[PDB]
Design a protein around this ligand. Structure first.
Ligand SMILES: CO[C@H]1CC[C@H](OC)[C@@H](NC(=O)CN2CCN(Cc3ccc4c(c3)OCO4)CC2)C1
Ligand SMILES: CO[C@H]1CC[C@H](OC)[C@@H](NC(=O)CN2CCN(Cc3ccc4c(c3)OCO4)CC2)C1
Lengths: 596, 596
């Protein structure tokens, strides 16, 4: 399908974001049978949308519940919407959503981090109130992204198992809304920005419109015309440009219009003029060598889980700005779309990740990771569909300078290369603008990994001195460099360390600088930094993690993952000031001299 | 003014609550001179609405800033709103707010926890976008509610000082919105429910016909009519009612409609049929003795300050439900209306407090608390105005069973009674339905207080064994018991302990059960409970506080107030289980019977 983020000029949305819906559990799994969307939810309670449902009620049985849950809400439809196209859009339902309006099923989606909309005009009457019922499922299998395993015991109780670290939060995590368009409406737009060395730049477009002759206008920050184009097809207007840069993040506004015989529809699209491309061992942004600093993040907060919140987004960006982070990565799933709009605006570099995590068996399980049990052709299809929807959404965001197909898959079994080759090829077919990468797990080193050649940038997740060599800084430095040099002598690609960090308990201090202590984190990060600056092919460092986040229960996780630089309530550990000295002490975007 | 909370039948709001607005500090105080509302705010950054501005940017200088701040946001007015009445309403701008639509000043308010709206119909055209600029001021003086003092140093730098505990968070803390009505609209409604002894009940109404003939219809939970009424006011129909009781919270829907010669306006009002009355030492709800259990709360959270959030509300009510709390008190300021709508629904008893706290000097300052300098006739006028706006807003909420005029004022100077006697009279005139109270500070005991007779219910804030008799439980028990009995033999009023608690560091454990330890909190609260059950006049217990909250910097406050049962991230201390065992172990609503 085609996807475009709603705005307001001749279009009007009403947020059904109003917090409180009706919520109910379907423990007996009657809901779809007893047609629960037809009547008002029985034995229901208030719940906040957006937000995960697991933590809202301080209940253990609800937090670790797997199966179907029901959302329901009434809404009055605007009067001036009669004879207009009305769309119902969810920014994300986590895992699975089925929507009904009144009694009419109108939607279905698998994929919990991408939006899905539907024309609902014939099932709605302006000035009248309608009932919106959503059925949310949080179950993961081997054909879902991410993968999982559900276990039904003798008592008929489901219990979900997964292969990634972060907790399986679910529910409507993001923005719900009705929004309108003329019956001649724009449903799709595509933009590609070419910039030379370095005088001027061209901009191609391609967009489809329901009834409509197409004019396009490239407007400046002053809303002044700097260029114009005719026709639906490719435009290519040249300009002496203010480039989209990581320091400023300048933006133009391409205004695209669609004229019918009776109707007219306008649509403003934010545009950043920049080019991303790999040239040897360097990552070039606007034909300039760049050095990634920042974090692997997580949509995780104390009471809302992965539910989006504006306050949290302002504070988290204030800390990253303060600490010197010039970039980050949407770790293990597509983030809220508002996150990327912020990045576009403030010139923040973003590596965009799919929800493709947990392709592992190592750490009644299948014997072959790539087989009809476990991962198969259907899984490959869902992965392909997942790669599609992310690009269909984020292709127009200047902040995205890379695509990440998956996170830490085991590429040691046989089917590994057979699985990833079509995907890596199909992705470059979907977007030639941005380089693509695949994040590499530890035990898949330079002599064992079988897929690192199919991608443009080498992204490594390393933990020498923690999981291995535990506690030995002397040996870890030796192993890391030799491992990095091995990767260099093999692919000669740009290397970004996309995950490095250790578990650190805030308030734990040690004179002996041992594990789990704040001293260790500082010392451990310090050793990694010295290794990075001795290797030319290293062009990026993203600390794991930004903040402490929640995980599934285990002996390896003390109330969640404690590898954060900040606590879960965003209080800084000693390492935050260490990272602050380094990241702000270097020339922006420019790598540290080889011992300097 | 007349104040009704917006709804949806022929009224339609677009929540422009949506978070991102432009923010700017006015350190030099140019804004009003240079007419900043004429142009787009210069040098601005994104900020979340609703929410305090102090913590959103992790900046200390912004956190402790005193003066003027500027908010700004553009918004499209709905097309189908032409020829309709358009109002711009703020649910609360903390302390001072001045609004402009484009260049047209439309609003001005003092009072930071009550709403203020304005007709903007002639200054707005449907289908077009307008610029909204708000000027927020966070300065407190002796004529503000609450009172404060500004200190300007040699360098002309302002620094706010106040006399209450909680931190002075400011900014747009609640809902900003535009909404419509027919030009014949309902502007006010007031309902008084009289109940005979549980068989049947009468319901008075009185409403202001902004422009129309008035009819009223009383519907139940099944949407069927149980009674009807005609004319602008003065109805009094009898009903066979399902009463609004604590624990359940049954509600009727009074439908008020106003017909012109051309237009009609509908307004649904939730109505709870219950009676509140004091009878000797007892507090009677529906002619039955009731026992308050619960908390003194605070609109406080980690990153949003006093900014409202649905998730936070849902979770906090889940905690209070679990722990057995049947009630609470809006500590030290009016809470968001959505908190009272929740209380109405779930049958939660609420003591409603004004922002009149800090009428104290005891704990270059004025020598007389009640004088022209300090608390004078202007203050009394602003205080009366504060009681007005609070009652005008919350009068129709079944959950509110008591008005609280002030919190812990010093009643030792002479002018104390000269000041409060008019206020207590004016309050009983504004609403004869509910008893009035004034929360009594410690050093104003049974032989020192000069004003507690002017109120219906005795509310005491006690801390024996903490501030005084520090650490001694045996002596504290004697003093407390002796003090409670003295109050009983003096006023013969119902006594509610509205504040009792000790500072407790989560994780601090002691075998000696000394102060600041989780053990002490349990021992201290338990001792207090033994005394309560030995005094008949005690009809309420409200622990201070629900959760740890932020305060101004001091040697008595360890990173804020730690008297919470829960931490600021809503994690339970050992005392939480102690209270849950007591509150859920007693029969609902009934005083412990000596009491097991
Ligand atoms: C002593 O060697 C073992 C010790 C345990 C480590 O984590 C299982 C092992 N893992 C690794 O070296 C590389 N991992 C890949 C997966 N990654 C995420 C993760 C981490 C902890 C988890 C989990 C997933 O699911 C259950 O608990 C951490 C880094 C090595
Ligand atoms: C005689 O011993 C002193 C020890 C210190 C106490 O001051 C908090 C005094 N307090 C009281 O007698 C009763 N107070 C009234 C004010 N109340 C809120 C408060 C508490 C601490 C504050 C604050 C306001 O502003 C500055 O620091 C706590 C209980 C008693």
């Amino acid at each position: 399908s085609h996807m475009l983020r709603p705005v307001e000029t001749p279009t009007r949305e009403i947020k059904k974001l109003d917090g409180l819906w009706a919520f109910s559990l379907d423990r007996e799994n009657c809901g779809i049978d007893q047609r629960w969307w037809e009547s008002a939810l029985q034995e229901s309670r208030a719940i906040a949308v957006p937000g995960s449902f697991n933590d809202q009620f301080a209940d253990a049985d609800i937090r670790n519940y797997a199966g179907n849950v029901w959302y329901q809400r009434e809404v009055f439809i605007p009067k001036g919407w009669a004879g207009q196209r009305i769309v119902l859009r969810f920014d994300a339902v986590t895992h699975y959503g089925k929507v009904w309006v009144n009694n009419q099923e109108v939607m279905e989606h698998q994929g919990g981090y991408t939006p899905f909309e539907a024309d609902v005009t014939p099932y709605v009457i302006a000035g009248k109130s309608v009932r919106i019922t959503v059925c949310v499922n949080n179950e993961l299998n081997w054909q879902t992204i991410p993968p999982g395993m559900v276990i039904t015991d003798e008592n008929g109780k489901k219990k979900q198992s997964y292969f990634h670290d972060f907790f399986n939060y679910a529910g409507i995590h993001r923005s719900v809304m009705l929004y309108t368009t003329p019956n001649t409406w724009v449903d799709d737009i595509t933009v590609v920005t070419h910039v030379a060395q370095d005088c001027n730049h061209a901009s191609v477009d391609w967009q489809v419109v329901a009834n409509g002759d197409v004019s396009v206008e490239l407007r400046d920050a002053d809303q002044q015309v700097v260029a114009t184009g005719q026709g639906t097809s490719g435009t290519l207007q040249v300009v002496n440009p203010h480039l989209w840069q990581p320091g400023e993040g300048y933006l133009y506004e391409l205004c695209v219009t669609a004229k019918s015989q009776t109707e007219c529809d306008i649509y403003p699209l934010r545009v950043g003029i920049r080019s991303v491309a790999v040239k040897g061992e360097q990552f070039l942004i606007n034909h300039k060598p760049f050095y990634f600093t920042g974090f692997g993040r997580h949509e995780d907060a104390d009471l809302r889980g992965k539910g989006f919140d504006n306050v949290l987004m302002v504070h988290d960006h204030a800390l990253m700005d303060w600490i010197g982070a010039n970039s980050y990565r949407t770790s293990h799933y597509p983030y809220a779309e508002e996150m990327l709009d912020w990045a576009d605006e403030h010139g923040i570099v973003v590596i965009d990740e799919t929800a493709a995590v947990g392709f592992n068996l190592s750490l009644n399980k299948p014997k072959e990771l790539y087989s009809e049990e476990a991962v198969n052709g259907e899984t490959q299809q869902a992965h392909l569909q997942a790669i599609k929807e992310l690009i269909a959404r984020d292709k127009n965001h200047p902040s995205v300078v890379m695509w990440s197909i998956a996170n830490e898959p085991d590429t040691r079994p046989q089917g590994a290369r057979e699985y990833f080759a079509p995907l890596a090829e199909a992705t470059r077919k979907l977007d030639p603008t941005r380089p693509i990468t695949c994040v590499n797990v530890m035990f898949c080193d330079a002599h064992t990994d079988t897929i690192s050649d199919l991608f443009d940038v080498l992204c490594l997740n390393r933990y020498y001195g923690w999981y291995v060599q535990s506690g030995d800084l002397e040996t870890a430095e030796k192993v890391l460099e030799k491992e990095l040099l091995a990767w260099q002598e093999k692919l000669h690609q740009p290397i970004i360390i996309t995950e490095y960090g250790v578990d650190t308990l805030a308030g734990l201090h040690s004179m002996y600088t041992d594990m789990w202590s704040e001293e260790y984190q500082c010392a451990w990060l310090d050793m990694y930094h010295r290794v990075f600056d001795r290797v030319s092919a290293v062009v990026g460092e993203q600390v794991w993690n930004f903040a402490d986040f929640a995980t599934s229960q285990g002996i390896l996780r003390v109330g969640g993952n404690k590898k954060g630089i900040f606590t879960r309530d965003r209080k800084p550990k000693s390492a935050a000031f260490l990272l602050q000295k380094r990241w702000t002490g270097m020339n922006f975007g420019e790598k540290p001299q080889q011992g300097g």
